[PDB]
Design a protein around this nucleic acid. Structure first.
Lengths: 159, 294, 218, 169, 58
RNA sequence: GAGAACAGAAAUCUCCAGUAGAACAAAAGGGUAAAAGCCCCCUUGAUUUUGAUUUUCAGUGUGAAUACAAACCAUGAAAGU
RNA sequence: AAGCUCGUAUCAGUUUUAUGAGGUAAAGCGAAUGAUUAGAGGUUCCGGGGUCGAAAUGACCUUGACCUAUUCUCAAACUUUAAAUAUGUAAGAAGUCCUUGUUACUUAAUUGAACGUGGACAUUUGAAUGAAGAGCUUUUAGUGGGCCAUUUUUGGUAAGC
RNA sequence: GGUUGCGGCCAUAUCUACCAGAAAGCACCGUUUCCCGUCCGAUCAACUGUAGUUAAGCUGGUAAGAGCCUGACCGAGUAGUGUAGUGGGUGACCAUACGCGAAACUCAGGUGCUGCAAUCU
């Protein structure tokens, strides 16, 4: 018959790594996790206590409560036509700080800095971000770069 | 030829970290010694680090950070001579004094010298450092011994008893001190009290100072030259115990040099890499010499 | 007794090899893959002729056997027993399956139709892609017309389309004739039983002097 | 050079592998007791063979590790049985040599009528000072190849001491 | 008589008519599943600030 | 792989090599090496009180599990478990 | 269907930027596992045979395994590497920065943790495009036999299976 | 810069064969009276730093070394793949249009960096 357990179809998903098996480095435990920190959930096969479900591998969440050795995470889960709020308890081995939020914070610092310097002269610093614009004109010169003409090649078997 | 490994075996070998390869860090235990309760977000889980080596006793208090472990206080046994200890810096009594030298030293810079005086009279009673009323909840540190094995009478635990007598709140049990009884689950303080003062080396001084002289002249010679006898083996350590409490200030040394001349004299005795151009010119010469039919 | 090759010409199923999940299969009906002067050295056979596949299909292990014998017989009786070395490049590794049904009248009572229709092994086959070499024969340049006719005759034993192509490479190596010739004038090549070992600049220098000595005694 | 790379014996092992368990080992250990001076320990059985008649953990053998001057003391008088000749085949690649004897009646325990007659499997392990880096828990390293005992080094040391000699090979 | 066993057909298209949007995000989320030890502390700390501010803003 | 009386391809003993090519009840897959493996010591934390949560899902039940809170202990020098 | 609260926003079957996750396609086997073609070179105190030998840990020829460097070909339940298309999170005012009040939790320590007090930063206020109004509630119908096409894919020789 | 104590990243740090290492330190190294564990003071418990030795450990260097790491218009815009056509072909399959784009191979380079403290001609 059919077989739907907790770790069904997780063969390669919780497979450890290439050449990284064994005890985990202690930067994973030295970390400090606050309420409201944005985290991603990558499991660790060695640590069996406090593993998440397969459904949350690679899913990013936010910390709501913190415990002695583990951490609670808020996850929104698509079921039906909606998002149902899901709460997970995870040891800090299967949780790592989401770096996605981080580059926005460094953007705020420059964004706050540029406005502060701009108001001294009022130049409309244009703090927004722009997408990649179409290129503008240029002059390409042929000193020592004279064009060389290429032609289609005939057929050969090479075997 | 026999100890030849294929490229298939070598490629897939995952090396131990760097100090598992040196047999230096029992990471399985260290994982317990530095991992903090998360709700204590940034509190440093300090650690009484005593590591035993030939000809020296090393005592340091260490916490752990991601970029590396941090030490605030260090006590050694080669700095005990300032208290009048030049012989036997590697016994259970010197391993005691360092636990007392560090305790005053680490409590100095913490400002907790006025309180938590510890056990001023040396008696050997198993007594934890009690928490004083409306006081700063005395300083808490923990042993790590590493790969050394815990037994009864091990000299790693002269450092702990040397620390609690200094006021450091180190949790411990009384069953691993020398003098503990296996038949009846208790310890006799009198026999332990001697070992604080060197009880084991005490009687062996006078018992063979007169019976055997050929041996007693080869070793224990420094005691003979310095005229140290068995009866004075206790009051010299009493001076140190009151010397530790007097000046734990831990003045540094002069190094007889600076950091620059230490490197400058050592840069000329090392060996350096061979240049990429030099390697190829070394390859070409060997071809023309060896394969060139002389 | 055996189904026509029509029924398994196309790659419809995933590869089904022999493993611990089959544990019982009929053995391959081709077991010899080297013919002629397989003992020959590298440099007596400068010519290579290939028979390539222009289709994505499956060749039966037993069609390979029939093709092998026909090409072997012609070249032996015309060119000589030791004038060539014939290698069947592709090996049959795919297991075919049959769902046995009763061929007698009244069969519709005891065969359960399509229920539980997972078939049993009754044959093997090879899987060949576009341009995959099927046969590679190495011989002397004077033997061109013979081995071409040999593969042309063996081409009649295979389903689909096949091409006969001269190889730019020297024998069974992967270097073309001018490159092998300039790597043979120096000490860069060392004879083996049928292949040749090439010198390379990576490795310990003392080893590279023990083998290919004339490369350095210039 | 050669300041502290002298060859000295690590230990001396005596093995007596009986095919059965019973009253023999009780007295087979007695000849080990008096000859060595130290009590021996039994050897269990790792797996059943059902042809030697040995069961799981049936205490089929007994052996004792001897170290120090007594092992040297046992070796010389024990090797006196072998009349001071020895095959080089008895020497191993890693640098260990030994010998076996039948009828221990020759030495020490001369007949001891209660125990009976028994043989021994002598074995001598050599090393040089510094071998504990392979044993010590901290900084457990590997001896260098210069300091490593060789098969020819063991046989040469065997000639000089005891003035012994080696057999054909 | 046999029938169809299971398909997900037309299930995603039904899900986009009244679709699958993220529900909401409120400020001051619930305290369900929080460490009780910190929660008892929170009440006592909360009362102290409220009473202290009440006296200052009496 | 090299060696030792009976003793050989399989007894027991020694050394060297050895990233798991063994074992961890069973099915298989992950995991695990100063251990999660093998041996020794002590004990019942396979205890007590009700809550939250994951899985399957209707965000029902049942089973399994996760991290907690309030007691009583075991072990260990201790960190901790 | 009835509406309800608001009036362009806590929006979106889309793209961009930044950051994750994955083990498929391909690829690979002079890399682990397993399968698999061919010879070459070596060693047996320790494989089977023929020759010279009473035998030797004596020698010679062959066959079997064993080791080394190669060689041909592969895998749904093999894999070092590893796409495409898909998939989670973020792109602000519920933000950022500064000072300090509470606590029965935590720390050696007014050390931290959470919540607040006071102050500063407003229309390029923090990518694109669009928004047809947005968010919410109650109730109730029918349906709960499906089928076809390109692409992916399993069983079957196949099938308007 | 060497060394030691404690670590961070966990091979650019590993493995094989050699060479060298001044000072200090680590080290090997001596003993069983003392507490402690063994068949065995071998590991270790305990003691001395004195009778000694750099032989090993460790560090560095060497090798057209093995492994590993880095980069490349090196293979290669190749394999593969999203999207399109009343394209081609009996079929198997293939070409074309708008996009994304490997791996093996080849070549070149490299073979630990670093935090706190103490300590060193």
């Amino acid at each position: 018959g059919k077989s739907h357990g907790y770790r069904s179809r997780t063969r390669y998903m919780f497979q450890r790594d290439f050449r990284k098996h064994g005890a985990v480095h202690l930067s994973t435990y030295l970390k400090v996790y606050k309420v409201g920190d944005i985290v991603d959930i990558k499991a660790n096969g060695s640590i069996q206590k406090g593993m998440p479900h397969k459904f949350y591998q690679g899913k990013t969440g936010v910390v709501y409560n913190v415990t002695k050795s583990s951490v609670g995470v808020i996850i929104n889960k698509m079921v039906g036509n909606r998002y149902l709020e899901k709460r997970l308890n995870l040891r800090v081995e299967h949780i790592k700080h989401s770096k996605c939020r981080q580059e926005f914070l460094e953007r705020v610092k420059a964004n706050a800095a540029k406005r502060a310097e701009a108001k001294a002269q009022g130049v409309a610093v244009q703090l927004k971000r722009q997408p990649a614009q179409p290129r503008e004109s240029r002059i390409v010169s042929t000193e020592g770069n004279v064009p060389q003409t290429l032609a289609p090649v005939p057929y050969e078997t090479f075997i | 030829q026999k100890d030849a490994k294929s490229s298939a075996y070598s490629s897939r070998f995952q090396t131990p970290f760097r100090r598992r390869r040196e047999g230096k860090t029992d990471y399985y235990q260290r994982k317990r010694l530095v991992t903090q309760h998360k709700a204590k977000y940034n509190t440093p889980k300090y650690r009484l680090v005593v590591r035993f080596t030939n000809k020296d006793i090393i005592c340091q208090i260490i916490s752990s950070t991601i970029t590396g472990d941090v030490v605030l206080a260090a006590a050694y046994s080669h700095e005990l001579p300032r208290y009048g200890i030049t012989h036997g810096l590697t016994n259970w009594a010197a391993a005691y004094a360092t636990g007392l030298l560090i305790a005053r030293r680490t409590l100095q810079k913490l400002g907790l010298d006025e309180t938590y005086k510890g056990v001023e009279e040396v008696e050997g009673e198993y007594e934890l450092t009690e928490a004083v009323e409306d006081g700063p909840r005395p300083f808490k540190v923990f042993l790590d011994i590493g790969l050394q094995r815990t037994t009864t009478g091990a000299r790693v635990f002269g450092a702990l008893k040397g620390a609690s007598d200094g006021g450091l709140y180190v949790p411990h049990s009384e069953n691993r001190f020398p003098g503990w009884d296996f038949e009846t689950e208790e310890i006799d303080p009198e026999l332990l009290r001697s070992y604080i003062f060197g009880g084991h080396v005490s009687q062996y001084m006078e018992e063979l100072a007169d019976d055997d002289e050929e041996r007693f002249s080869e070793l224990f010679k420094g005691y003979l030259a310095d005229d140290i006898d068995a009866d004075s083996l206790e009051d010299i350590y009493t001076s140190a115990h009151e010397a530790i409490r007097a000046d734990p200030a831990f003045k540094p040394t002069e190094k007889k040099f600076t950091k620059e001349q230490y490197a400058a004299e050592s840069k000329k005795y090392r060996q350096t890499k061979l240049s990429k151009e030099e390697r190829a010119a070394r390859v070409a010469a060997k071809i023309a010499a060896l394969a060139g039919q002389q | 007794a055996r189904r026509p090759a029509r029924c398994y010409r196309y790659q419809k199923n995933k590869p089904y090899p022999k493993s611990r999940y089959n544990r019982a299969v009929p053995d391959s009906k081709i077991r010899i893959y080297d013919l002629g002067k397989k003992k020959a050295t590298v440099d007596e056979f400068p010519l290579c002729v290939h028979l390539v596949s222009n289709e994505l299909e499956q060749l039966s292990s037993e069609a390979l056997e029939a093709a092998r014998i026909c090409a072997n017989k012609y070249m032996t009786t015309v060119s000589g027993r030791d004038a060539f070395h014939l290698r069947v490049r592709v090996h049959p590794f795919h297991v075919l399956r049959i769902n046995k049904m009763l061929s007698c009248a009244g069969a519709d009572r005891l065969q359960q139709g399509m229920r539980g229709a997972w078939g049993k092994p009754h044959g093997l086959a090879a899987r060949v892609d576009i341009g995959q070499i099927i046969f590679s024969v190495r011989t002397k340049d004077s033997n061109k017309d013979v081995v071409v006719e040999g593969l042309r005759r063996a081409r009649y034993k295979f389903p689909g389309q096949q091409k006969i192509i001269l190889s730019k490479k020297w024998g069974f190596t992967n270097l073309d004739r001018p490159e092998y010739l300039k790597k043979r004038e120096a000490g860069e090549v060392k004879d083996d039983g049928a292949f040749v070992k090439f010198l390379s600049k990576k490795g310990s220098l003392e080893n590279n002097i023990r083998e290919f000595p004339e490369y350095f005694a210039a | 050079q050669n300041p502290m790379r002298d060859l000295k014996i690590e230990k001396l092992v005596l093995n007596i592998s009986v095919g059965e368990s019973g009253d023999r080992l009780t007295r087979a250990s007695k000849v080990l007791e008096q000859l060595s001076g130290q009590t021996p320990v039994q050897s269990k059985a790792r797996y059943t063979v059902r042809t030697f008649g040995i069961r799981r953990n049936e205490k089929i053998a007994v052996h004792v590790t001897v170290r120090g001057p007594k092992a040297e003391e046992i070796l010389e008088r024990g090797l006196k049985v072998k009349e001071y000749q020895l095959r080089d085949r008895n020497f191993s690649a890693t640098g260990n040599f030994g010998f076996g004897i039948d009828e221990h009646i020759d030495l020490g325990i001369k007949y001891d009528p209660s125990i009976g007659i028994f043989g021994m499997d002598f074995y001598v392990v050599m090393n040089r000072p510094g071998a504990r880096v392979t044993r010590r828990k901290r900084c457990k390293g590997t001896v260098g190849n210069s300091h490593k005992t060789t098969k020819e080094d063991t046989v040469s040391w065997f000639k000089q001491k005891y003035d012994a000699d080696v057999l054909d090979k | 008589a046999k029938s169809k066993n299971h398909t997900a057909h037309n299930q995603t298209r039904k899900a986009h008519r009244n679709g699958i949007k993220k529900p909401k995000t409120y400020k001051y989320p619930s305290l369900k599943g929080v460490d009780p030890k910190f929660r008892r502390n929170h009440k006592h700390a909360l009362h102290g600030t409220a009473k202290a501010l009440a006296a200052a803003k009496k």
